[PDB]
CSV table of C-alpha atoms and ligand atoms in Angstrom, one decimal:
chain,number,residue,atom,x,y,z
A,320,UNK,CA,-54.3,-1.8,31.9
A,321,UNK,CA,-57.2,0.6,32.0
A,322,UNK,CA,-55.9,3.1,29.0
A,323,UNK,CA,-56.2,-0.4,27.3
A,324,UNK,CA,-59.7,-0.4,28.6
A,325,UNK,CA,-60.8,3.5,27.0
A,326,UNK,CA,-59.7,1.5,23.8
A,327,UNK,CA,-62.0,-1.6,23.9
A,328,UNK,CA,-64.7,0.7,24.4
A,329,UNK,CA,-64.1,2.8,21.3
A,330,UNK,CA,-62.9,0.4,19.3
A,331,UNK,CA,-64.9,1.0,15.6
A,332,UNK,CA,-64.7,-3.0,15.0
A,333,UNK,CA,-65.0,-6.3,17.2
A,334,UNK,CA,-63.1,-9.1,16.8
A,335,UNK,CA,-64.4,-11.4,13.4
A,336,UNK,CA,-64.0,-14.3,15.5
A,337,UNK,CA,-63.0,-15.3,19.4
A,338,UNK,CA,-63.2,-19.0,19.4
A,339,UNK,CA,-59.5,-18.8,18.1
A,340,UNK,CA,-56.7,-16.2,17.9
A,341,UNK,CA,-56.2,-15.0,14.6
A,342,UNK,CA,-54.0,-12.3,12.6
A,343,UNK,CA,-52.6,-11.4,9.8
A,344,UNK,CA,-55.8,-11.4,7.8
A,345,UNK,CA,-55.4,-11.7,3.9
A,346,UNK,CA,-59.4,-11.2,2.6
A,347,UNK,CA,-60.3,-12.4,-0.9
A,348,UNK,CA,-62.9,-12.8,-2.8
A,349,UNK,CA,-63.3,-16.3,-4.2
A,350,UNK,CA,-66.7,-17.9,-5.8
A,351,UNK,CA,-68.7,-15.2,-5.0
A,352,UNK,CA,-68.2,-15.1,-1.2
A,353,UNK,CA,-65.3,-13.6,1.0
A,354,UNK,CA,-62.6,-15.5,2.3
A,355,UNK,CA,-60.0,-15.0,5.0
A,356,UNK,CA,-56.4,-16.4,5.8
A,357,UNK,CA,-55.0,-15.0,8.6
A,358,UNK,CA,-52.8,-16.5,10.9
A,359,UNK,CA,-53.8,-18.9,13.8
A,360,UNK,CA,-51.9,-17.5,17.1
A,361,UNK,CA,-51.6,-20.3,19.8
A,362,UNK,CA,-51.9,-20.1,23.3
A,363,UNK,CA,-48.9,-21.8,25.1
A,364,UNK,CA,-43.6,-15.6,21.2
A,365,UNK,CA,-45.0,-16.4,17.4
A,366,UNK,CA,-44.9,-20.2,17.9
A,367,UNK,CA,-48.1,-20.4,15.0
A,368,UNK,CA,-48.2,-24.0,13.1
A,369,UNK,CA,-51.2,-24.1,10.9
A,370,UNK,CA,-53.9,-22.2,9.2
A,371,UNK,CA,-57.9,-22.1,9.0
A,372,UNK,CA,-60.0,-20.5,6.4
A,373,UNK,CA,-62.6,-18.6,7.2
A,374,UNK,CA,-65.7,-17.3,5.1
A,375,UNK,CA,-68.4,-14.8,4.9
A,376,UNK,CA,-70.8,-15.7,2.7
A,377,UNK,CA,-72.0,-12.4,2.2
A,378,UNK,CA,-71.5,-8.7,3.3
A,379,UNK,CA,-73.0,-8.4,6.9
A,380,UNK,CA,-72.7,-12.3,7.0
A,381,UNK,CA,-71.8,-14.2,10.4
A,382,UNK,CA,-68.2,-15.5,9.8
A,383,UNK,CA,-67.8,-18.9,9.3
A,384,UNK,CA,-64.8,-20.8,10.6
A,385,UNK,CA,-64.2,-23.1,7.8
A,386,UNK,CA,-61.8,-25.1,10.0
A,387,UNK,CA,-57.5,-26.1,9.7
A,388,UNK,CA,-56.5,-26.7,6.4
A,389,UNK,CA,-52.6,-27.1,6.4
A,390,UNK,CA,-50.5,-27.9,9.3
A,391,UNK,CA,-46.5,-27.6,9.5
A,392,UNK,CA,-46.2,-31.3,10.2
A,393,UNK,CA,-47.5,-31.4,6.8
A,394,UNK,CA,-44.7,-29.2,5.2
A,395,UNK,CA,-41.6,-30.7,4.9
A,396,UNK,CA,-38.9,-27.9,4.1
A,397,UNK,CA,-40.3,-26.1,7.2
A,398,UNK,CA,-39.9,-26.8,10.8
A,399,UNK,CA,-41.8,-24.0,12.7
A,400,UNK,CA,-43.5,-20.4,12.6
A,401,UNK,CA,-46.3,-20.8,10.7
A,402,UNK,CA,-46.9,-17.0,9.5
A,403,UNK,CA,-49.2,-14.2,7.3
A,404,UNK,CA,-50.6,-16.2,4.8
A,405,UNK,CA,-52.2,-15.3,1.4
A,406,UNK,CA,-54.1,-17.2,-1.3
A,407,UNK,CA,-54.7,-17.2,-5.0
A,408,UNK,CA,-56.6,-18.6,-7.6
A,409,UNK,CA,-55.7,-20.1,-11.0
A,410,UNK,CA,-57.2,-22.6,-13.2
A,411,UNK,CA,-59.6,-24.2,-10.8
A,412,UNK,CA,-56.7,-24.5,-7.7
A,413,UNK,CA,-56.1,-22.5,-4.8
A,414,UNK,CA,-52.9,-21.8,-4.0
A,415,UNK,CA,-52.1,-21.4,0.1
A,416,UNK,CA,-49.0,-18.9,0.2
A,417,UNK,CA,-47.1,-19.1,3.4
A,418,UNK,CA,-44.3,-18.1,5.4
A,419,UNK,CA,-42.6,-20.6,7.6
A,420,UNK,CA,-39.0,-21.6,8.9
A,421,UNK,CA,-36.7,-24.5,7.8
A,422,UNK,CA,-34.7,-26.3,10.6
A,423,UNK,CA,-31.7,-23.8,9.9
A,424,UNK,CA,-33.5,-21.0,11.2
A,425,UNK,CA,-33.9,-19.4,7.7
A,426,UNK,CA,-37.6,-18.2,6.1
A,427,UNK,CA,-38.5,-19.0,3.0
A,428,UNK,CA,-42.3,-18.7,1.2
A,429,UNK,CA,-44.0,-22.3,0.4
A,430,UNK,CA,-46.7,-22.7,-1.2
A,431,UNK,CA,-49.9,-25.3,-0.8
A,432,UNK,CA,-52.2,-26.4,-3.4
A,433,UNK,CA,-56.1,-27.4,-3.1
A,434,UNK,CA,-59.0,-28.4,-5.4
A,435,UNK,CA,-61.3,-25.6,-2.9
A,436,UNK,CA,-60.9,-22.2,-1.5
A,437,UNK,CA,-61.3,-23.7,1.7
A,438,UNK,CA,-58.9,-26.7,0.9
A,439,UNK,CA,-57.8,-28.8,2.4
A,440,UNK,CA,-54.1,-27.8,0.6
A,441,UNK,CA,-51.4,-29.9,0.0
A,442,UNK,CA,-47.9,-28.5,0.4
A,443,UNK,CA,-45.4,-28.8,-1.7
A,444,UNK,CA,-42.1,-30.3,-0.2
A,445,UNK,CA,-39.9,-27.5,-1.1
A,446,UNK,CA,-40.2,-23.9,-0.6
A,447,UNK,CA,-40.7,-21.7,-3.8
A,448,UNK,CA,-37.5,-20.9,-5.3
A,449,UNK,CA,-36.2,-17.7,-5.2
A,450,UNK,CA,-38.3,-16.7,-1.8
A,451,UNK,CA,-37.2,-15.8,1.5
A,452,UNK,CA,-38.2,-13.6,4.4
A,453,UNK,CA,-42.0,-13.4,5.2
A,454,UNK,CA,-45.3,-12.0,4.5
A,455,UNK,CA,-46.4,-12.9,1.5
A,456,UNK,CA,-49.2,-11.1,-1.0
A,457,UNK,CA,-50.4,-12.4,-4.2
A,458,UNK,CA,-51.8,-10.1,-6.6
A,459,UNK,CA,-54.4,-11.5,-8.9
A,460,UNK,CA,-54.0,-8.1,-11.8
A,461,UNK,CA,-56.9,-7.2,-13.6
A,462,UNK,CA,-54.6,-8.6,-17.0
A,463,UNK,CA,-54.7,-11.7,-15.7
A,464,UNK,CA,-51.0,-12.2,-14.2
A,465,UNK,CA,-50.1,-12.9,-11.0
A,466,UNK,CA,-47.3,-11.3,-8.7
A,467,UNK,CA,-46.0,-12.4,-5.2
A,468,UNK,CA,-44.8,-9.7,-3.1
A,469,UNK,CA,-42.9,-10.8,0.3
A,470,UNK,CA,-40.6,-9.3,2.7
A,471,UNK,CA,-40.4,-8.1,6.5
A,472,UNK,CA,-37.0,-6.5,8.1
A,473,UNK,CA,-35.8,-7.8,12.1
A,474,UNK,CA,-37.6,-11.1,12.7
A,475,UNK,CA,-38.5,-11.1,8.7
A,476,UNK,CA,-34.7,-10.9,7.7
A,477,UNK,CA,-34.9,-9.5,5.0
A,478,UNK,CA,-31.8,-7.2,5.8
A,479,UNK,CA,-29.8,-10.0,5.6
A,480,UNK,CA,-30.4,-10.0,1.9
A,481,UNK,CA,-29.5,-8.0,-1.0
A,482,UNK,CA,-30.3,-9.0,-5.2
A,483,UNK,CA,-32.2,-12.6,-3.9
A,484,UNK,CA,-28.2,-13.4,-1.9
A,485,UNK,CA,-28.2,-13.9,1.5
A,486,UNK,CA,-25.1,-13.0,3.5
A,487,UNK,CA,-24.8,-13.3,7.5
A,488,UNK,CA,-22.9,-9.7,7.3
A,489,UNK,CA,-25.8,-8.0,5.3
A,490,UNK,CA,-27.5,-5.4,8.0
A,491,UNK,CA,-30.7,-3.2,8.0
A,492,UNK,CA,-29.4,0.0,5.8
A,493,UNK,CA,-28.8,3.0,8.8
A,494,UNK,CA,-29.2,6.8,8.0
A,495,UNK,CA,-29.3,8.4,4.6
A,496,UNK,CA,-29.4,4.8,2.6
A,497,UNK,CA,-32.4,4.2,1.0
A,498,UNK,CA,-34.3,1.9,3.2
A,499,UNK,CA,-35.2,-1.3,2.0
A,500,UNK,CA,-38.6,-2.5,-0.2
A,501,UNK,CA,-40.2,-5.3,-0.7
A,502,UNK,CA,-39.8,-8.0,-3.7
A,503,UNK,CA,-42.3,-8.5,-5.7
A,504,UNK,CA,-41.9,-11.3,-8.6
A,505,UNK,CA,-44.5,-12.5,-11.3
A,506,UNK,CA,-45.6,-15.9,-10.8
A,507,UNK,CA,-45.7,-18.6,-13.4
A,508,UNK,CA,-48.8,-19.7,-14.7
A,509,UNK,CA,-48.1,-23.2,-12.7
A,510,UNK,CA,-48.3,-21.0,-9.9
A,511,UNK,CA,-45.9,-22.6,-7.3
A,512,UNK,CA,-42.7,-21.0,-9.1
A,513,UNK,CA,-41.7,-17.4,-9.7
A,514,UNK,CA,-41.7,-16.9,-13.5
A,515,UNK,CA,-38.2,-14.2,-12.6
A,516,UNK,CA,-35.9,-13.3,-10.5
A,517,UNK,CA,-37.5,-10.8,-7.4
A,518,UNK,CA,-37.2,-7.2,-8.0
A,519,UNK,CA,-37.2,-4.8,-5.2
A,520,UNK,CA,-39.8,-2.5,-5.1
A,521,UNK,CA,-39.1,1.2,-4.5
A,522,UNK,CA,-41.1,3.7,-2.2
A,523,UNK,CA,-40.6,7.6,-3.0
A,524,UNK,CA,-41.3,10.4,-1.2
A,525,UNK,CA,-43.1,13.7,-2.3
A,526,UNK,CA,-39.9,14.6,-3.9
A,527,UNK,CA,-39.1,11.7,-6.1
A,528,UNK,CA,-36.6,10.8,-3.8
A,529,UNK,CA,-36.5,7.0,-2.4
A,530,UNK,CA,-37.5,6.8,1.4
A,531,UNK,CA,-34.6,7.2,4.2
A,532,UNK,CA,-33.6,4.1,6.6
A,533,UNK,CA,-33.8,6.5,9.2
A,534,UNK,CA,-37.2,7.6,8.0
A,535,UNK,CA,-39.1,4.9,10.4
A,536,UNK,CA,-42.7,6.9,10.2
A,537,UNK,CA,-42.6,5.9,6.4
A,538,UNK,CA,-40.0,3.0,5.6
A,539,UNK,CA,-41.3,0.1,4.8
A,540,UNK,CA,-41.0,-2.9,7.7
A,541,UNK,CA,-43.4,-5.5,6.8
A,542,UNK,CA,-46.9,-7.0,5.2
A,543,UNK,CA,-46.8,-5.8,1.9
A,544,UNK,CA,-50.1,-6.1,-0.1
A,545,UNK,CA,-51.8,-4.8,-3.2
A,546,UNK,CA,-54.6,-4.0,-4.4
A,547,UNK,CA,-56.0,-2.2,-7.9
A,548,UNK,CA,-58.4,0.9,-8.3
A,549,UNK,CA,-58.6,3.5,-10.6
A,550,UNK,CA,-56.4,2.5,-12.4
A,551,UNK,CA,-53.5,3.0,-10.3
A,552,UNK,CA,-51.6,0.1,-8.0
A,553,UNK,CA,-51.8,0.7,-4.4
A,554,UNK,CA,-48.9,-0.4,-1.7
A,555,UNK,CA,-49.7,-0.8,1.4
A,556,UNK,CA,-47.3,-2.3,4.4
A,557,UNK,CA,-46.7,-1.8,8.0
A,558,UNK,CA,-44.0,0.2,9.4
A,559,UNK,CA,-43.4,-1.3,12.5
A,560,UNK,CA,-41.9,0.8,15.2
A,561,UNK,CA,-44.4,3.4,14.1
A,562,UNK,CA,-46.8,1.2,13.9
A,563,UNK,CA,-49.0,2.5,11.3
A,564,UNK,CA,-50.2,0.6,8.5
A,565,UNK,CA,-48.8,3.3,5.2
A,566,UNK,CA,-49.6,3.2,1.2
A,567,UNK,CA,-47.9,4.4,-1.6
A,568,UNK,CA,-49.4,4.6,-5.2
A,569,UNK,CA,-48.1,3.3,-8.7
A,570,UNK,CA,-48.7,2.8,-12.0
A,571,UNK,CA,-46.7,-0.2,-12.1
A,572,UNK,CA,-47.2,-3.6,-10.1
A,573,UNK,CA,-43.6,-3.2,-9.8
A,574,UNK,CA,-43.5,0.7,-8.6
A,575,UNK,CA,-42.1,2.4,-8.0
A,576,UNK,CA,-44.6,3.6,-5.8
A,577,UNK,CA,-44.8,7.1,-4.5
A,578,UNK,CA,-46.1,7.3,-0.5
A,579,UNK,CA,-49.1,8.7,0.0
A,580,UNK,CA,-50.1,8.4,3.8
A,581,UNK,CA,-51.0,6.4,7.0
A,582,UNK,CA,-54.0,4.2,6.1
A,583,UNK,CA,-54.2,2.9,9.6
A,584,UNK,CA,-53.4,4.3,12.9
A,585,UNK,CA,-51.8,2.8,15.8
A,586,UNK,CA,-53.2,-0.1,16.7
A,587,UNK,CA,-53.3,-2.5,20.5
A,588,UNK,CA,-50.3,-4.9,20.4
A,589,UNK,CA,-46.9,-4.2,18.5
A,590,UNK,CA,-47.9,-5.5,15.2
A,591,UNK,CA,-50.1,-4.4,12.7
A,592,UNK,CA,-50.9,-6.0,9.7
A,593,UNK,CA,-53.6,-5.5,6.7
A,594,UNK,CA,-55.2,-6.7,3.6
A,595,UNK,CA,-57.9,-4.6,1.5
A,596,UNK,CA,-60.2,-6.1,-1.0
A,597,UNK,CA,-63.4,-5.1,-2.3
A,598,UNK,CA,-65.8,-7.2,-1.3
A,599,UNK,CA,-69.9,-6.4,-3.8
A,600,UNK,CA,-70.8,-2.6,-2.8
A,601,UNK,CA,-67.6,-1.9,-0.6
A,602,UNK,CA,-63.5,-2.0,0.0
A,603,UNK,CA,-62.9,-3.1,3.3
A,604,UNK,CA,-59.5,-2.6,5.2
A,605,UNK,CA,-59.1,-6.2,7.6
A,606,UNK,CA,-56.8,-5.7,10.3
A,607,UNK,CA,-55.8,-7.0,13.6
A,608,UNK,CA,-55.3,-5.9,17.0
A,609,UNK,CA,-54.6,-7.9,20.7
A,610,UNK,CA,-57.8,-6.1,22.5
A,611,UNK,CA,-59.4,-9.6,22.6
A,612,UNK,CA,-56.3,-11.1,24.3
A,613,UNK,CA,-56.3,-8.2,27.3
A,614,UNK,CA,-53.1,-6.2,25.0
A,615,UNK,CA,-50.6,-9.4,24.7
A,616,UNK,CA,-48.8,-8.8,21.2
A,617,UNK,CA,-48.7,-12.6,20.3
A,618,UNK,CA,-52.1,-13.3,21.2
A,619,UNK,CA,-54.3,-11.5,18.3
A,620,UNK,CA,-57.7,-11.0,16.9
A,621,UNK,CA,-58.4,-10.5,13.1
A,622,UNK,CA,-61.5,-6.7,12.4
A,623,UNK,CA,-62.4,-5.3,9.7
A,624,UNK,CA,-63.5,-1.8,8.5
A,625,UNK,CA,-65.2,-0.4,5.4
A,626,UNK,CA,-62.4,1.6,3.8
A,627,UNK,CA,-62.9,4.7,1.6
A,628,UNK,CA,-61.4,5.9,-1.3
A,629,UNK,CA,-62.1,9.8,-2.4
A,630,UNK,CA,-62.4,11.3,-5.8
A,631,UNK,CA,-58.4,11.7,-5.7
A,632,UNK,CA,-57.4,8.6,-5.1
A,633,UNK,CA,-56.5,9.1,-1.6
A,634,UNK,CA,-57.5,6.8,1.1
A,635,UNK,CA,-58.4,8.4,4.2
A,636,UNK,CA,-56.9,7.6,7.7
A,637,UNK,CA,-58.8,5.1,9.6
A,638,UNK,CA,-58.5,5.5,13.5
A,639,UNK,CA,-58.9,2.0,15.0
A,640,UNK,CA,-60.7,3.5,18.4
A,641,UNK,CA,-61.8,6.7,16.8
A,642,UNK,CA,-59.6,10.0,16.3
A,643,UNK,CA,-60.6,11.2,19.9
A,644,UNK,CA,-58.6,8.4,21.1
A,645,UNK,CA,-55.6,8.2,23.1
A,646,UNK,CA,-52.9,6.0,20.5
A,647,UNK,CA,-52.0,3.1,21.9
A,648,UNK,CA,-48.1,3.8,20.5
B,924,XYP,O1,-46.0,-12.7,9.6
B,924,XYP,C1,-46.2,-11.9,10.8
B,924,XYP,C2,-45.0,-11.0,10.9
B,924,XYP,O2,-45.1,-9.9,10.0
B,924,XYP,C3,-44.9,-10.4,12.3
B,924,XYP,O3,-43.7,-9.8,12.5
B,924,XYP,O4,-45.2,-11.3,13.5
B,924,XYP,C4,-46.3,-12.3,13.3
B,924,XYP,C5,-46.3,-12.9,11.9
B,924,XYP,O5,-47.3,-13.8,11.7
B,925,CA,CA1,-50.0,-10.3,4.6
């Protein structure tokens, strides 16, 4: 626990906030100032049963810890495991997008409505339709739709499913199947139902062809989220094993989107998990890492970095302790 140490010291970004554990940051902006929903990790595995909102008011600001706004006593389709949240806005309402368990043991995506961006938000009793696994992004298009993208293999189990059916004996694809991609669905304009059926989304590789299961430095795992510039889509999602947070480009919202590179390196802890939003005179990349909690995977703390695109379109690398350091994976 000392090459942990190295790593503190060169980390590029503190911790946002260390009052509470916190991950899984999804960073928006909403009336004019930047808001946060990330995941509130518990002291006592991912045992996480409600969300805050936080804020910065500006860029530079102090963040603000806007306080809990929806709890899983609250929800009543789910029992447990709170997880990566997202929001959205529409018609005056924020929308609280969430992950969360139902006393079966299956995940599904709920969603929670409020008259704020900071709520409070009132669930709605049932999941959304047509939802399952985890990790949930909502894309608020420049044309004005809206699509939900959601999925995360092992714990996630989204390898259990296959066109929107589950099926115990569905597996993880092995070898030279195409690995699995998130679903990504427009949202009505009521906003707490899919307007379709979810469609897989499709990663290629520099040949046109769609990335390997056994291709774990690329494949998508989990966290999908999307964000538009230049008039292009860009995917981006963790990758688990690897560790790396990776993006792909489009000129769809539904792909298929063609990889491009790692947009985050390794990070401390075996998760990793991202949003990017522009927030006045910069793109930011929000991340999360368990420095703050002395390396313990479940306990996290929510950074952020200014992010860069080039003239290409590209999005360079950014190295969490600096290049010079030793990965933690
Ligand atoms: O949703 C997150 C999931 O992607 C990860 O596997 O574990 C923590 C969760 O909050
Ligand atoms: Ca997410």
């Amino acid at each position: 626990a000392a090459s942990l140490q190295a790593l503190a010291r060169t980390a590029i970004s503190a911790p946002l906030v260390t009052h509470l554990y916190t991950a899984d940051p999804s960073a928006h902006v909403f009336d004019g100032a930047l808001y946060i929903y990330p995941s509130h990790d518990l002291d006592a595995h991912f045992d996480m049963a409600d969300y805050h909102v936080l804020r910065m008011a500006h860029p530079g600001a102090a963040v603000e810890d806007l306080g809990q706004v929806l709890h899983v006593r609250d929800v009543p389709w789910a029992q447990r495991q709170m997880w990566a949240p997202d929001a959205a806005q529409r018609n005056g309402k924020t929308y609280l997008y969430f992950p969360a368990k139902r006393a079966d043991g299956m995940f599904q995506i709920g969603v929670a409505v409020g008259d704020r961006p900071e709520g409070p938000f009132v669930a709605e009793p049932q999941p959304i339709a047509g939802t399952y696994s985890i990790d949930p992004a909502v894309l608020a298009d420049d044309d004005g739709a809206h699509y939900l993208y959601f999925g995360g293999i092992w714990g996630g189990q989204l390898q259990h499913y296959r066109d929107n059916a589950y099926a115990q004996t569905h597996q993880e694809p092995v070898g030279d199947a195409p690995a699995l991609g998130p679903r990504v669905a427009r949202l009505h304009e009521r906003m707490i139902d899919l307007a379709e059926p979810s469609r897989e989304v499709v990663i290629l590789d520099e040949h046109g062809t769609p990335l390997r299961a056994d291709d774990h430095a690329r494949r998508f795992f989990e966290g999908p989220w999307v964000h538009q510039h230049a008039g292009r889509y860009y995917l981006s999602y963790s990758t688990g094993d690897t560790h790396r947070i990776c993006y792909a480009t489009s000129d769809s919202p539904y792909g298929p989107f063609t990889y491009q590179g790692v947009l985050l390196a390794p990070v401390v802890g075996w998760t990793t998990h991202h949003s990017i939003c522009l927030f006045q005179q910069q793109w930011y990349l929000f991340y999360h890492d368990s420095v703050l909690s002395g390396g313990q995977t479940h306990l996290r703390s929510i950074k952020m970095a200014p992010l860069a695109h080039a003239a290409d379109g590209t999005i360079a690398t950014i190295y969490p302790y600096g290049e010079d350091a030793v990965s933690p994976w």
